[PDB]
Amino acid sequence: AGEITKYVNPFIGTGAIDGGLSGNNYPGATSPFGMIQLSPDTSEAPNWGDASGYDYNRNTIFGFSHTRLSGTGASDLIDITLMPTSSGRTSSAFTHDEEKARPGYYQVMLKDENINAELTTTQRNGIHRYQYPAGKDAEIILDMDHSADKGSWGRRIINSQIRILNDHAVEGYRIITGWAKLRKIYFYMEFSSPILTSTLRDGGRVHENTAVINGTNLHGCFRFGQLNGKPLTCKVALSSVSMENARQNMEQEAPHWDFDRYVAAADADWEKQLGKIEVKGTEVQKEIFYTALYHTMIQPNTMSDVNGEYMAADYTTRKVANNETHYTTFSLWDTFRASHPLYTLLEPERVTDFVKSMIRQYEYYGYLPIWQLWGQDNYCMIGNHSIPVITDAILKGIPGIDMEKAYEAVYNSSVTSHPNSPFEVWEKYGFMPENIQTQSVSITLEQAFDDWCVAQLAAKLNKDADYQRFHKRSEYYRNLFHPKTKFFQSKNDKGEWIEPFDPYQYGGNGGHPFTEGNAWQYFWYVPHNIQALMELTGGTKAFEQKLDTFFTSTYKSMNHNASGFVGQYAHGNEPSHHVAYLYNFAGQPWKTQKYVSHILNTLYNNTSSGYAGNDDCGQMSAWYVFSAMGFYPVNPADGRYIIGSPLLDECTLKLAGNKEFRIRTIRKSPEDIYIQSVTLNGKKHKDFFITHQDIMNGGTMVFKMGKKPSGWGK
Amino acid sequence: AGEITKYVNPFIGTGAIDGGLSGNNYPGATSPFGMIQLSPDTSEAPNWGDASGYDYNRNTIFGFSHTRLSGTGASDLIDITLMPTSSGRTSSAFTHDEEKARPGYYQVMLKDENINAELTTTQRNGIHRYQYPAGKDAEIILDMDHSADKGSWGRRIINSQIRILNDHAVEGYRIITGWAKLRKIYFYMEFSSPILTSTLRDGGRVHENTAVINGTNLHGCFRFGQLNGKPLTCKVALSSVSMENARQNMEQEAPHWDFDRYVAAADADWEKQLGKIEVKGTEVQKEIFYTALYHTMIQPNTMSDVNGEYMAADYTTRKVANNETHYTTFSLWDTFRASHPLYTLLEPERVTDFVKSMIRQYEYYGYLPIWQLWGQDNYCMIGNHSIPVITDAILKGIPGIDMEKAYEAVYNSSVTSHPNSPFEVWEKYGFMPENIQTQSVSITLEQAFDDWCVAQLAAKLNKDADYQRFHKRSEYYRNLFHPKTKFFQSKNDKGEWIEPFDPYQYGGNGGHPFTEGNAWQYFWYVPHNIQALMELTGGTKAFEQKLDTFFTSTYKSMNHNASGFVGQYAHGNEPSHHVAYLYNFAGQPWKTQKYVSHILNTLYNNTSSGYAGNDDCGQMSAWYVFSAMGFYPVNPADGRYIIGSPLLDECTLKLAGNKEFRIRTIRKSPEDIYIQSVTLNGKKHKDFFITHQDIMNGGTMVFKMGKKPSGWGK
Ligand SMILES: OC[C@@H]1[C@@H](O)[C@H](O)[C@H](O)c2nccn21
Ligand SMILES: OC[C@@H]1[C@@H](O)[C@H](O)[C@H](O)c2nccn21
Ligand SMILES: [Ca+2]
Ligand SMILES: [Ca+2]
């Protein structure tokens, strides 16, 4: 018990060094792909700098809430907040010295009044256990106002309710706006001891011992008297649909009152999840690796209730079939790159539900998700990056996906214009003109890649006319390639290059042709035709040389999303993430190995500041998981993984059937970062990639490593 | 055909004279107690001065929307707006000369482009017919942004959609805030001719021939080409729950495309409704009377869909039983006085659903409605005036009401404190202190009356302890009766009379102890113990004298809700409405008859400015209906109607069974306003009231009238 789970350190990514963006992870309890993230908030109102609610540099806890995002650069959720107290207090100091976390478990001693808080979860319930000093009164404060910063996104509470049903049960809801336009969060809560007195309020309006209150700024205080020394256990279930659903969620998943038993089931559940990859390496490597793997598995989030009901993207209540689960929290601009490829390896059964969930947005909203939060699109970032995810699953043969319905959704999302996707402009110009559509160069590149995916899906279904159309569109990166400067640059609607152009200059999220990066970084974004890109650059040697400049040029111009620098390579944001693997394509695999190894060893660590930037729903972590094993999905829809440099001594992927993909290394020391040779299933392996089918068949792959570059693949 | 419906003039109450508040009625098509109010908007953004959307003093139509309130002093709804055009225009001039309206039908010639618009409805569908000139293009503009004034109530569109399903079908929705906190309006629309081209937009973002758009500021234009000379018919169904429900609403109620047939069914439906009272009088009287009766029957509004589903007050989707309908639009501060009593006479089957609907708010929200709009409370005005309505129905024996569940709702709404109802303050002080709860005197009086109702209901169910409690509370008006001045006046929490006090001074809706009136007007609000009030005033002669001062004192101090003045009596707002009947209680029935007759003949007319103030969901109209027949529910929960002065020569109420209550007059001329004697079922009638049971038994009542006061009841 705890062989693997003891390696996860939930505090990795919860802080930042001295400036530089936090990982924005949280240390509190959750379950795999769960609905509940039960965690302390170290802010009264979480914002972009502490978007999960927890910041390791802070020393005050303002309550325990039940929902949040992991690693995002904008805050939302933070719903249903409990705080223990003996004297109506709403905050407490704490120290990291008297605080612990592990998969499914969080504990902290609240110092102001010496109350011990422990947290665990099921898929849809949060479970609390609070120990008050003997001789002191036990109270719980319920805060329904506490949320992400109300000065952002037009965020306000439209309406809410707290309703005491009996001496051990409370229910309510909040309807709230924000980064997601409209969310409804219903709850059902029970206590292990009877409520003796209580107070409800809405702002300055206070009602003593009153069974219900409605309003926009609601707070409850429940008083249990002297319980010395019995702990108070609280159970809280949520739903996007109704209080009835939430109650039913509790009846099915959390009927009992054995706290330690919930803790043990969460740990067991996490041991099975993390056990999908058995690794061998140093103790620090296993900590960093299993923590990263944990970060990939805490979302997408369960949205449907145990009865299958969910709020759909048309704001109506719908129901999935009995063997299906509706998911949300799709940070797709990030997660299409590595996280979704990882789920095809470890979570094929869940991938079918992720895809079905994406398709429901098309069905009820008109196009697939761009960035999805609480069952609805918020259009964050760029592209239509459901498309690679859905394409990749289908091409790989992930079972249970209706391919014709999936194609309809992908096709219609690629021809029906919508914000940041003016498709008539796209097909008329063969690029996005900056004066018509901003973030034009980044969109042109990323959308071109989305279009390649559509083409591959059309080819699979024998839709020849569609293949031509979308293949031609996949080639529109060519229309922005400048033949003198050899960068992709912005043009206007007259077909003229905008001048002046500085390839070091950062753009934001509009008002500039690049999205949270510069032209140096976006140059590499032709993942579906690296051969064409190399040719345009002047051939393999010229392409190698440009990569060398990229990795060594230290000019600081600036966007705060960019950090974790290797020259102009910025590991802290995701446009760079595929680039270190590109030396393979240029005939210098040793340089990929050199740079990958440098990033793994130098831009990740096992402290609070352990990621180079925002984790972004586990994308930064997924990069580590992939790269540490020794390969990466450069084109996340072609079913190939490009070999880098294996960090760990061994890795074993557990697959369906009783199959295993066994990765092994022959090395003398940790200096042995260069690949001398590779074998797959006993035959010498002559390519710089392994296929998805090679992995899912089961088999074994051996790397002979060495301290010096060989001529392998060179 | 049209014997009765030809008397209704929908333009009565749609204007105002030269200042003074409009009736705020609308002339467009609707069905009895319907979901759809299909009517032109003469404003871009309706506000308090034109809250239904139509103002008779205006000459431009900005579209035809499908929802509104009748006669309210605040605007909401105004959802789903169509406008015909031949050249993308969004407004048109019109004249009353080329415009018509009658129950279930509205027509207007739009002058700018010579397009004829006709409108009718079913319970849940709006039906349009537009005739374009031969040789001109047919287009429809769909405006999803058009609404009540967005500068009030924090009103904004959270999200919306327009989605073209095929060449003849469009669906969508809007989610919007306002006077009601959150409303979701889903629609399904069909055209009689195929859409040839189209445009959708969200603000400046325009998408040509695109099947769907999402956003907060959406507009569609649909182009049908040259249809000369076939009219374009449009059908539009709504739902509070889903597009599927809306479609199903159309399939059940409006499958066909015969416009004239829809018109005829609406007229037939209205003929049965208005036929519940057959009246004889002058032609002008029948116009004023049947129009008033129409105004009482256009709300409460159907909210549940044909499958029984509705949005409940916890914002969840629920379903009523197959023989039930969920209603909303309960303007209770107004309608508890006369409109709800009228529904007990004419609409007992609907009253059961109204009561069930009120109880659903208690079940899902925690207390009964105060003022209900689109299935939720907005707390407008004062009191808990569901209570008289629910009490009155139960005491009268309206069938199908669960009395124990109803009592639970009434009781819990009377002891669970909530905004404007601090019940612990109430029971500690025996009044509302002005420094703790504003509008204190008006609330004290009205809440005292609500409490009498609870007491009567407790007595009916043999709950003796409850009877005492609420009877004692019904007497709290005594604690604000000033023994020197003989007015009800405000006190502070030390029990001290606030000074100075001016009984002419108007209050608003907070910051003053009276609600949209002065102390002169609120003095009469002890409807449940007029005997006690007369005694406190110094006896019947003193009480008579105070009424005389009230009806003759012309001092102008001012609140714009108060208008239609007879001295300090202000017919234009509803605190005054019972007062002319109080001379009966004082031993001077002839003075009631004098003043009632004066109000009927002088403060109502058959022009656009035909009401003395806001109709308030038919309360002003209900006053006319009752008073013209010759009696009024002074205490709207004791099942007595106080005799005034019958205006009409005859009236016949059609009741269940084949029963009739036949009211007849013996008179020589219209000067004969004074009652000489009364007979009921052939026996001489010695009381100044008739009972509800006397009416519902069927029978006949004869008034001998004369030009001069008799000593009848004197
Ligand atoms: O969190 C949402 C998005 C991310 O998808 C993306 O990685 C981007 O870097 C970013 N900065 C702030 C917010 N975001
Ligand atoms: O329309 C809602 C309420 C009415 O219930 C009431 O008659 C009052 O006079 C009033 N003035 C403006 C709005 N209102
Ligand atoms: Ca990022
Ligand atoms: Ca009024």
Author numbering:
A (entry chain A), B (entry chain A): 20 to 576, 579 to 735
Q: What sentences appear in the manuscript?
A:
Structural analyses of two glycoside hydrolase family 92 α-mannosidases, BT3130 and BT3965, together with mechanistically relevant complexes at 1.8–2.5 Å resolution reveal conservation of the global enzyme fold and core catalytic apparatus despite different linkage specificities. Most enzymes within family GH92 are exo-acting α-mannosidases that are capable of hydrolysing terminal mannosidic residues with a variety of linkages, including α-1,2, α-1,3, α-1,4 and α-1,6 glycosidic bonds. Complementary to α-mannosidases within largely eukaryotic mannosidase families (particularly GH38 and GH47) that play important roles in N-glycan processing, GH92 enzymes are metal-dependent, featuring a single Ca2+ ion coordinated within the catalytic active site. GH92 enzymes act via a classic single-displacement mechanism, leading to inverted configuration at the anomeric centre.
ManI is derived by the annulation of a deoxymannojirimycin piperidine ring with an imidazole, resulting in double-bond character between C1 and the endocyclic N atom, thus providing shape mimicry of the oxocarbenium ion-like character present at the TS‡ of glycosidase-catalysed hydrolysis. Therefore, to ensure observation of the true, catalytically competent forms of these enzymes, and the determination of meaningful ligand complexes, BT3130 was screened for crystallization with the addition of 10 mM calcium acetate (final concentation) to the protein buffer (in addition to avoiding K+-containing screen hits), while the subsequent ManI complexes of both enzymes were cryoprotected with the addition of 1 mM Ca2+ (final concentration) to the cryoprotectant solutions. Cofactor supplementation was successful, allowing determination of fully occupied enzyme–Ca2+–ManI complexes. Within the active site of BT3130, ManI is coordinated within a network of interactions: hydrogen bonding of O6 to the backbone amide of Gly92 (Gly70 in BT3965), hydrogen bonding of O4 to the side-chain N atom of Trp390 and Oδ2 of Asp353 (Trp383 and Asp344, respectively, in BT3965) and a hydrophobic stacking interaction with the side chain of Met400 (Met393 in BT3965), which is positioned directly beneath the plane of the sugar ring. The carboxylate side chain of Asp353 (Asp344 in BT3965) makes a bridging interaction, simultaneously binding to the inhibitor O3 and O4 positions. Remarkably, despite differing substrate specificities, all observed enzyme–inhibitor interactions within the −1 subsite of both proteins are fully conserved.
